[PDB]
Ligand binder design. Structure first.
Ligand SMILES: CCCCCCCCCCCCCCCC(=O)O
Ligand SMILES: CCCCCCCCCCCCCCCC(=O)O
Lengths: 195, 195
């Protein structure tokens, strides 16, 4: 199916940002390096710098790949409850709050101490994680059993990205159940705008 | 009936922040102290830090104000549009954008170098900003001509403030017009759930 470098890169890559998901799991993202990371994945320094390019590049690199994995859990519950827009979107959001919170970088941004660059990533240059997780999300609405026309379905997903990105930094309050409001908020969007 | 010492501090606050709103016109929020403003605001050092106390006390403060200058042209343009939700919601939002962008503390967030302080406020530590401007905006839909069942005003509002904060924290990446698209998503909610 796919050539050597093509599948040998994506091995290296998922092999680091797996190592990172591992170092980060007992220690905190300020306490971790290219070097501490390289060591843990069993590569050189000079390789992570070529593949990612920096400690920054790894970081965002961590993020993007998380974004992907997160918008993809959606097709899960979309297939789960078919023909029912509320119960689909309920479980889709129930999940996304479950998952995003349990991630080591999330947890290490939230409870860990005052990271400038984690912060700079979720703000000043989010151009990548946002642009990307949008077009990736959009097809859950456009291609699948939830009819949505195309431009209506960018507008929707493009907003659902910017929300989740907010609820990641600033997590829903256990007083009231957020997944639900949000479901009830987009369903009225869903039905008007399908084909 | 404003118990004296009370309405005097309220007068006190707007005294300082109107100093900085004026200060950040010639400078950027990096070059401002307490004792940087307490001078052109016309008060003593010790006195100001007794009300706020941090640079990021008086910054967090300027923020809940701007939350409110901005959450309050809602009821205003919500009612200038009576009967048509999309025109209402739109024009309401268009102001919130061309306003937000005009404020000097935000022009500090944006073109100003690197404030890892500010980015703490609009994201992880945004918790009070959102939480206030949330119920503050709630009534606009409850007590106005969009007669919105009480819960659905927060289900609406908890959402419209998060999504707004996030053009401040994370600047629009492409040129598609965001007030437009934002109007678009909540309209079909309101049509069904208004009363
Ligand atoms: C540094 C932190 C990284 C955060 C990355 C977050 C990416 C957000 C993606 C949005 C996922 C949308 C899931 C909701 C699915 C549904 O409609 O039910
Ligand atoms: C530097 C920090 C600033 C923080 C700004 C917080 C903004 C909160 C926004 C609430 C305004 C909602 C606008 C509604 C308009 C409408 O529906 O017609």
């Amino acid at each position: 199916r796919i050539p050597y470098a093509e599948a040998s890169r994506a091995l290296l890559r998922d092999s680091v940002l797996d190592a990172m998901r591992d170092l980060l799991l007992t220690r905190d993202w300020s306490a971790i390096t290219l070097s501490d990371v390289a060591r843990a994945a069993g590569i050189s320094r000079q390789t992570i710098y070529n593949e990612f390019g920096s400690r920054q590049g790894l970081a965002q690199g961590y993020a993007l790949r998380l974004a992907d994995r997160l918008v993809d859990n959606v097709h899960a519950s979309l297939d789960a409850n078919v023909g029912n827009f509320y119960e689909a979107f309920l479980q889709g959001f129930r999940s996304f709050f479950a998952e995003s919170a349990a991630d080591p970088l999330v947890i290490s941004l939230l409870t860990g101490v005052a990271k400038p660059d984690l912060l700079q990533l979720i703000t000043t240059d989010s151009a990548p994680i946002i642009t990307r997780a949008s077009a990736r999300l959009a097809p859950a609405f456009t291609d699948t059993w939830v009819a949505t026309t195309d431009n209506d379905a960018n507008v929707l997903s493009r907003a659902i990205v910017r929300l989740c990105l907010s609820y990641v930094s600033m997590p829903p309050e256990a007083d009231h159940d957020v997944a639900a409001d949000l479901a009830r908020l987009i369903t009225p969007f869903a039905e008007r705008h399908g084909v």
